[PDB]
Write a protein that binds this ligand. Structure first.
Ligand code: HEM
Ligand code: CII
Length: 424
């Protein structure tokens, strides 16, 4: 009957929802600043118990699906995956080679010098890497920029208003729904193309299954492919963007990465060899970029039961959340937490390893990211190519690069303009 501590503000119609839709990171920080390790905010009719700090995070991440339910906290993903999506080491070398090929293909028309937008570039690139690795090169080769454009609209369909109702007549939801129909149409044209113009991939596997009448429709197959690509797409896309931004903002780090790439590749081995082995300075830049710009800024659960955390009672049906955005910057755990300090991961400090429950850009415990090794390899492969072929400079003030946090799916904001010039 005791109310949990509640953060200030949230006097709008849906409580803190409006703030969560505009500045979720400031809201979550205020929870911690006012209340400490366990505090709440109101998301429309739902209480969110926001945990932070080592002890509370440990509870969150060590909880089994019996205690804290992940999938129930994401009902808004239903219109994205669709009705019927009811939610290896031996391959990695091949995937690194695939990634190298996709990056070379993306920069093939760059020429001597030019300008890119990082969101446009990395969003499209990572559609190709994800589709090629997860579904097949044959399928990627039947994709072009339209698939990326549509997939982006789908991701933009995750306004937190979806916690009120995911089918409200707002434009972002209408565009989410239309984008999904557009993706189904692309997949149907691909299926038809294969009939008329017959080396196999997962799409071939799915087409072959019989109910015989074919078992799966374009709609069903498309939902499967959307779901397969979702976790790794915006996360990898944003991380690649922020990696390049932070290298440009910190030229000393950029210079060290260049030297090391040039030294490492001097053994004559491929990207598929080196992307699976240490590239130390780049890896520490990546760790720091993830600490500062975690693409998942909040992680949601529904409590299945009663638990106590620091003498605060969580009850069944409470939404319960952790936040990499906030936890990754706890100043007692990460000295100078707003500063970009790749040295914090060198053997002497290992701040990622020592702070097991608060360095959480890839989660922790029971829910440690199963895609982390792939995502890390993919950054290594991408930058092994980009940084050896081209030099990059910022085309706008360094502090003006920023994320759009208005949707549950975080995206780099535009402009994110960067110039390149061939390395001599
Ligand atoms: C840089 C890219 C990525 C980041 C920052 C990231 C982040 C995370 C985070 C924060 C969690 C914990 C989720 C939670 O506790 O609710 C997680 C778990 C997970 N991620 Fe990722 N992820 C990335 C890429 C990927 C990729 C490429 C895949 C696979 C295609 C993937 C699949 C998963 C899976 C299967 C889990 C386990 C969920 C659980 O058991 O709790 N992720 N990831
Ligand atoms: C947070 C996003 C809305 C999105 N979440 C999801 O796609 C799932 C919803 C239900 C099952 C858990 C996650 C997502 O991209 N999640 C992940 C991305 C990565 N790695 C792990 C999860």
């Amino acid at each position: 009957a005791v109310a949990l501590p509640r953060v200030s503000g949230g006097h709008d119609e849906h409580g803190h929802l409006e703030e969560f839709r505009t500045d979720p990171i400031g809201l979550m920080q205020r929870v911690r600043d006012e209340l400490g390790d366990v505090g709440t905010f109101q998301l429309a009719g739902k209480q969110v118990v926001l945990l932070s700090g080592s002890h509370a995070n440990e509870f969150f991440f060590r909880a089994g699906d019996d205690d804290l339910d992940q999938a129930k906290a994401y009902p808004f993903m239903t219109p994205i995956f669709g009705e019927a999506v009811v939610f290896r080491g031996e391959q990695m070398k091949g995937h690194a080679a695939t990634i190298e090929d996709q990056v070379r293909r993306m920069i093939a028309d760059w020429g001597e010098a030019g300008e890119i937008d990082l969101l446009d570039f990395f969003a499209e690139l990572t559609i190709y890497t994800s589709s090629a690795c997860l579904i097949g090169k044959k399928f990627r080769d039947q994709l072009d920029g339209r698939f990326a454009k549509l997939y982006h609209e789908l991701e933009r369909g995750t306004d937190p208003l979806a916690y009120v109702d995911p089918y409200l007549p707002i434009e972002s939801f209408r565009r989410r729904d239309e984008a999904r129909n557009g993706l189904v149409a692309l997949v149907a044209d691909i299926m038809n193309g294969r009939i008329a113009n017959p080396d196999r991939d997962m799409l071939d596997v799915l087409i072959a299954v019989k109910a015989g009448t074919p078992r799966f429709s374009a709609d069903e197959i498309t939902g499967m492919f959307i779901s397969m690509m979702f976790a790794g797409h915006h996360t990898s896309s944003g991380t690649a963007s922020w990696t390049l931004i932070e290298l440009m903002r910190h030229r000393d780090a950029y210079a060290a990465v260049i030297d090391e790439l040039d030294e490492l590749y001097g053994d004559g081995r491929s990207v598929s060899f080196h992307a699976l082995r240490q590239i130390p300075q780049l890896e520490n830049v990546l760790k720091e970029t993830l600490r500062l710009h975690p693409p998942l800024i909040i992680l949601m659960r529904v409590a299945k039961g009663e638990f106590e955390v620091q003498g605060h009672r969580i009850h069944e049906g409470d939404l319960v959340a952790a936040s990499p955005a906030i936890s990754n910057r706890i100043p007692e755990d990460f000295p100078d937490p707003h500063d970009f300090v790749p040295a914090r991961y060198e053997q002497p400090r290992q701040e990622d390893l020592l702070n097991r429950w608060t360095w959480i850009p890839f989660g922790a415990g029971r829910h440690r990211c199963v895609g982390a090794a792939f995502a890390i390899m993919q950054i290594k492969a991408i930058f092994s190519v980009l940084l050896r072929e081209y030099e990059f400079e910022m085309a706008q003030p360094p502090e003006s690069y920023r994320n759009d946090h208005s949707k549950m799916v975080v995206q780099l904001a535009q402009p994110a303009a960067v110039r390149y010039r061939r390395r001599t």
